[PDB]
C-alpha cells in the first residue's frame, strides 16, 4: 500500500506559567514512531516503537538538536503572531504544523505537503505544485510574502522530495514487521433492558487492530441501519481498540436479529445473536 | 527525519 511519513508539531504558549510547551510527534503509516516533548524529564527525541531502537545514537543526536532549534523558533513565532494579529501579551495561543510526504507502493512520491494552523484555524499551506503557498488570512499573507522573497519553498521541496522520501523508505524496512501486522476482534451481544418491556440489543467488539472495523444490524436480509446506536472507536491500551453498536427491538423478537463484524484480520466476517 | 522550520 501507499505509505506516508508525517510530522505533527505543537507550540503552545502559557504566559506567567512558564515557557511555551513544544512537541514534535512523528508517524509512519500513521502510527507514532518518535516523539519530543519539551516538557519531559530530560527533553530528547525518544523512539516510540521498538523497531526505532535499531537506530544509532548519532541519529538521536541530530533529531534532538533539530527539535531544540525548532522549539526555539516557535518561541519566536508565537510572539510574531501577537503583533500580526494585534493580540495581547498575556493570553494563551497555539501553533500547529503538519508536514510529510506520501509515497506510492512503487516508491514514487505522490504528495508532499506542509500546513500551519494558528489557534486551531488554518493559517498557511503549501500548494500541490510544491512551488507556491496559499494564505488563509491577512497575517498569513505577511508570512507568505516573506517566504516567497526568501525562496523558502525550494528548501521545502528539496526536503520533501529528498530526505523525507529517502528516510521513509528506511523506517519502512526497520518497522515493517511491527507495522503491517494485525489482530482479529472477538464479539458478543448483550441484553441491558432495565426492568422494562422493550429490548435494546448491543454488539461488542474488542481486541482488534487496526481501528478500522465496521459493525451492523440487519433484519435478516434487509438493513436496520436507521435507528442503530454506536459509539466512536476507542483505544483499549495495549495497542488495540474497542467498539460497540446497538438498536431497539420489540420484546419477544430477539433471535431474528443478527450482528455483523468486519475486519481485515478475519478470514470471514463474524455473525452472532444473543448468548 | 523532521524538518527545520522557517519562522512565520
Amino acid at each position, epitope marked *: 500500500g501507499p505509505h506516508s511519513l508525517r510530522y505533527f508539531v505543537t507550540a503552545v504558549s502559557r504566559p506567567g506559567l512558564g515557557e511555551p510547551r513544544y512537541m514534535e510527534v512523528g508517524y509512519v503509516d500513521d502510527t507514532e514512531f518518535v516523539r519530543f516533548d519539551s516538557d519531559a524529564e530530560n527533553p530528547r527525541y525518544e523512539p516510540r516503537a521498538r523497531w526505532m531502537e535499531q537506530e544509532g545514537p548519532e541519529y538521536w543526536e541530530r533529531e534532538t*538538536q*533539530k527539535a531544540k532549534g525548532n522549539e526555539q523558533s516557535f518561541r519566536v513565532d508565537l510572539r510574531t503572531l501577537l503583533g500580526y494579529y494585534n493580540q495581547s501579551k498575556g493570553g494563551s495561543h497555539t501553533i500547529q504544523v503538519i508536514s510529510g510526504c506520501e509515497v506510492g507502493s512503487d516508491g514514487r512520491l505522490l504528495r508532499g505537503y506542509q500546513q500551519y494552523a494558528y489557534d486551531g484555524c488554518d493559517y498557511i499551506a503549501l500548494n500541490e505544485d510544491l512551488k507556491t503557498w496559499t494564505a488563509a488570512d491577512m497575517a498569513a499573507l505577511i508570512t507568505k510574502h516573506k517566504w516567497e522573497q526568501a525562496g523558502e519553498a525550494e528548501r521545502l521541496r528539496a526536503y520533501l522530495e529528498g530526505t523525507c522520501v529517502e528516510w521513509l523508505r528506511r523506517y519502512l524496512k526497520n518497522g515493517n514487521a511491527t507495522l503491517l501486522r494485525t489482530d482479529s476482534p472477538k464479539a458478543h451481544v448483550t441484553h441491558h433492558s432495565r426492568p422494562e418491556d422493550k429490548v435494546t440489543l448491543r454488539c461488542w467488539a474488542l481486541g482488534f487492530y487496526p481501528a478500522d472495523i465496521t459493525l451492523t444490524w440487519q433484519l435478516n436480509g434487509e438493513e436496520l441501519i436507521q435507528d442503530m446506536e454506536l459509539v466512536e472507536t476507542r483505544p483499549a491500551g495495549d495497542g488495540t481498540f474497542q467498539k460497540w453498536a446497538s438498536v431497539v427491538v420489540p420484546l419477544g423478537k430477539e433471535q431474528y436479529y443478527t450482528c455483523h463484524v468486519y475486519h481485515q484480520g478475519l478470514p470471514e466476517p463474524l455473525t452472532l445473536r444473543w448468548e | 527525519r523532521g524538518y527545520v522550520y522557517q519562522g512565520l
Partner: T-cell receptor, first 116, second 113 residues
Framework: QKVTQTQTSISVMEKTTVTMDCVYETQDSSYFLFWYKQTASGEIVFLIR??????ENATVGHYSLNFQKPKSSIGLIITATQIEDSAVYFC??????????????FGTGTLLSVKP | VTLLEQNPRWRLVPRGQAVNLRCILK??????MSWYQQDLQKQLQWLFT????????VKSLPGADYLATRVTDTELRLQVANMSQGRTLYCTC??????????FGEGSRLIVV
C-alpha cells in the same frame, strides 16, 4: 575542519582572473555557503552565496562561484581583477541547525593582493 | 543606508577593564541579531544570537567573558569582561534563522593598552 581555506595569500596582476579555494564539511541535508570580504578598515562586506539544493553556480558582478558538491568544494572566482579588489576573502557556511541561532562558521581567510 | 549601527567604534583599555558595546538595528526586516568576534589573527567566531527583548546570555571564550542582552527590538548590547587580549566585535543581522544572509556592522575594535 568545518570550513577550510588552504591558501594564505594570493598575489596577482591587475586584469587577471583569480580563484580562491574553500572546502567544507557538514552533515546537514540543506546548507548555505558564503563569501565575504574584509577591507583594510575592517568592514565585512557580503559578496555572494550558494544554496546546496540549487543546481547552478551562483554569479553576481565579477564574482562567481564554482560549486562542486561531490568534492565538498566552493571556489570564488573573480574575473578581471581590479586594484580595489584587494582584501581578505572569507569563505563561510551556515553552522548546523540546533538551538544555536544564527551560526556562520568561517574559514581562516585569504589575502588577495592585486598589483598595479 | 546601512542596516546596523555599532558603538563604540573602538576602545583603548588596560587588561581586565570591562567594556560595554551597543548595536542599533535601523531596518526591522532583519530582527535576528548576533555578536561575532574576530581575534587578532582574524578568525571570526560566533558568540550569540538574540531574537527577543529580554533575551539575556553568557559565554566564556579564551581571553574574554561575555554577557549579551537583546534590550528592545532594535537595541542589542554586549558586556565584555576580563579582556586579556584585544579582539573586535561585530554585530550582525539577518532576516531569519535558517539560510538567510548575515550582514555585518562596522565592528567595535578593542585594544588592550
Amino acid at each position: 575542519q568545518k570550513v577550510t581555506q588552504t591558501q594564505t595569500s594570493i598575489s596577482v596582476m591587475e586584469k587577471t582572473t583569480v580563484t580562491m579555494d574553500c572546502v567544507y564539511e557538514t552533515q546537514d541535508s540543506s546548507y548555505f555557503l558564503f563569501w565575504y570580504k574584509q577591507t583594510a578598515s575592517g568592514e565585512i562586506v557580503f559578496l555572494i552565496r550558494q544554496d546546496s539544493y540549487k543546481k547552478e553556480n551562483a554569479t553576481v558582478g565579477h564574482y562567481s562561484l564554482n560549486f562542486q558538491k561531490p568534492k565538498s568544494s566552493i571556489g570564488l572566482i573573480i574575473t578581471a581583477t581590479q586594484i580595489e579588489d584587494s582584501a581578505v576573502y572569507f569563505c563561510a557556511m551556515r553552522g548546523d541547525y540546533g538551538g544555536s541561532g544564527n551560526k556562520l562558521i568561517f574559514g581562516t581567510g585569504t589575502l588577495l593582493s592585486v598589483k598595479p | 543606508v546601512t542596516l546596523l549601527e555599532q558603538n563604540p567604534r573602538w576602545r583603548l583599555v588596560p587588561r581586565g577593564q570591562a567594556v560595554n558595546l551597543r548595536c542599533i538595528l535601523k531596518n526591522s526586516q532583519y530582527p535576528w541579531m548576533s555578536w561575532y568576534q574576530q581575534d587578532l589573527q582574524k578568525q571570526l567566531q560566533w558568540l550569540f544570537t538574540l531574537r527577543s527583548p529580554g533575551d539575556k546570555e553568557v559565554k566564556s571564550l579564551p581571553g574574554a567573558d561575555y554577557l549579551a542582552t537583546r534590550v528592545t527590538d532594535t537595541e542589542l548590547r554586549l558586556q565584555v569582561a576580563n579582556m586579556s587580549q584585544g579582539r573586535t566585535l561585530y554585530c550582525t543581522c539577518s532576516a531569519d534563522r535558517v539560510g538567510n544572509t548575515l550582514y555585518f556592522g562596522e565592528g567595535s575594535r578593542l585594544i588592550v593598552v
